[PDB]
Structures are given as structure tokens and as C-alpha cells.
Amino acid sequence: MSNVFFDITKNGAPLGTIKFKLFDDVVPKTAANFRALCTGEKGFGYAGSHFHRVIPDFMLQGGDFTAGNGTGGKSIYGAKFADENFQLKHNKPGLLSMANAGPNTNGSQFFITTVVTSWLDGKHVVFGEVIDGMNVVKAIEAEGSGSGKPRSRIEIAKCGVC
Ligand code: PRO
């Protein structure tokens, strides 16, 4: 039940570290998946992956470590897993939430919000929150574009539990 972190680089240059708390008491399965993808314990995970879709004033999206473009990724349970619950709302910036392709299609892709996104409530499972490094989140956000195409390669150079 440890917190997790990402060390971020921009075109290979260190940008800083983002630390997160996961809500295991509410969404234990979803939190465990993300934690294990941070440690890399199953032989795959977020290390070396990048943020493929970044939209300023909305969110930063990553986690596709199989295809790097929004079409891939996988969970520690299989290709996909069910929406655990929608108890937690997208009620502030800095929340971790699962990206998906409709109901019960969670894999490894996730997003970090940069604004309140209440319209996503009931559609995406919220499972964690930034506890340090919101300045790094804002730096990544600044590399986005309206289409979501990033202006630079924003990589999770290292990740794990802390
Ligand atoms: O990528 C998108 O735009 C939607 C909204 C956040 C998660 N999936």
C-alpha cells in the first residue's frame, strides 16, 4: 500500500518527479494494477513509456507501454478488467484516473487531470492523486497541444514504489 512515483524526462532531460497516493481503501484492484505497473514486477510496466496524449487545460494521458499511441497497454490481470467502482469523483486537478475504450475496458492507460473534469464521473475510475510534483505535471501539460499531440517526448524514465 505504498505511494508511487514517476521520474520524468523531456527529450531525455530530467524534468522532475511526480509522487502519488493510491486509493486502495476504495479501489484496491485498480490501485494494485497501477502500483504493479510502476514497480514493473510482472515483467512489464510504465518504465520507459511516454505520455502520448497531452491536452492543456484538461489532462495528461499515458500508460501505453505496448504500442505507445493510445491503442495498447495491458493490466496485470489480463488485457482488460472491469470498472471497479465510480465512488471517487474527478473533483480537482491532480487526480489519477483510468483511460478506457468504454465500460469495463481498463488496461494500463491512465490520465492525470489538470482541472476539474466532472463530466468524466461515472465513465472513468479515479484511483489516486498527486501528492508532490504538481509543478512537473504543469510542465508536462505545457508540452501538449489542442489535438493532444505532444511537442516533445515526455517519458517515465523511472518509476516504482516509495
Ligand atoms: O483521451 C480522452 O480524451 C478521454 C478523456 C480522458 C480519458 N479519455
> Is the minimum distance from the CB of 5 to ligand 1 under 6 angstroms?
no
d(CA 133, CA 98): 20
| CB neighbourhood size of 121 (10 A) | 14
Question: How many residues belong to the chain?
Answer: 162
Cβ–ligand 1 distance for 110 under 6 Å, the answer no
Distance in angstroms (rounded) separating the CA atoms of residues 14 and 16: 6
Q: Do residues 59 and 51 make contact, with C-beta atoms less than 8 angstroms apart?
A: no
Resolution in A: 1.5
Its CATH architecture, for the domain 1-162, is: Beta Barrel (2.40)
CA separation (Å) from 135 to 26, 30, 50, 100?
27, 25, 18, 26
Contact 126, 3 (CB under 8 A): no
List the grid coordinates of 93.
Answer: 486537478
Residue of 161, 160, 125, 131 whose CA lies nearest to 27: 125
Report the sign of the C-alpha dihedral through residues 110, 116, 132, 146, in that order: positive
CA distance 87 to 80: 20
Q: Experimental method for this entry?
A: X-ray
From the CB of 111, is ligand 1 less than 6 Å away?
yes
Cα–Cα distances in angstroms (integers) from residue 24 to residues 12, 61, 75, 84, in the given order:
32, 21, 16, 11
* Residue 120: active-site member: yes
- Report residue 82 CA to chain centroid gap: 17
For the question of residue 60 being annotated catalytic, the response is no
Ligand 1 atom 2: the closest Cα is on which residue?
A: 99
Q: In this structure, which residue's CA is closest to atom 8 in ligand 1?
A: 99
What is d(CA 74, CA 13) in angstroms, rounded to the nearest whole number?
28
Q: Is the CB of 99 under 6 A from ligand 1?
A: yes
DSSP code at position 76: S
| Long-range interactions of 33-37: CB distance < 8 A, separation 24+ | 33/75, 33/76, 33/77, 33/81, 33/106, 33/108, 34/4, 34/96, 34/110, 34/127, 34/128, 35/2, 35/4, 35/161, 36/76, 37/63, 37/65, 37/76, 37/108
* Residue among 59, 64, 123, 126 to mutate when testing ligand 1 (max atoms within 8 A of CB): 59
DSSP 8-state assignment for residue 118: G
Q: Which of 3, 44, 86, 100 is catalytic?
A: 100
Give the residue extent of every domain in the chain.
Answer: 1-162
Cα 113 from chain centroid (whole Å): 9
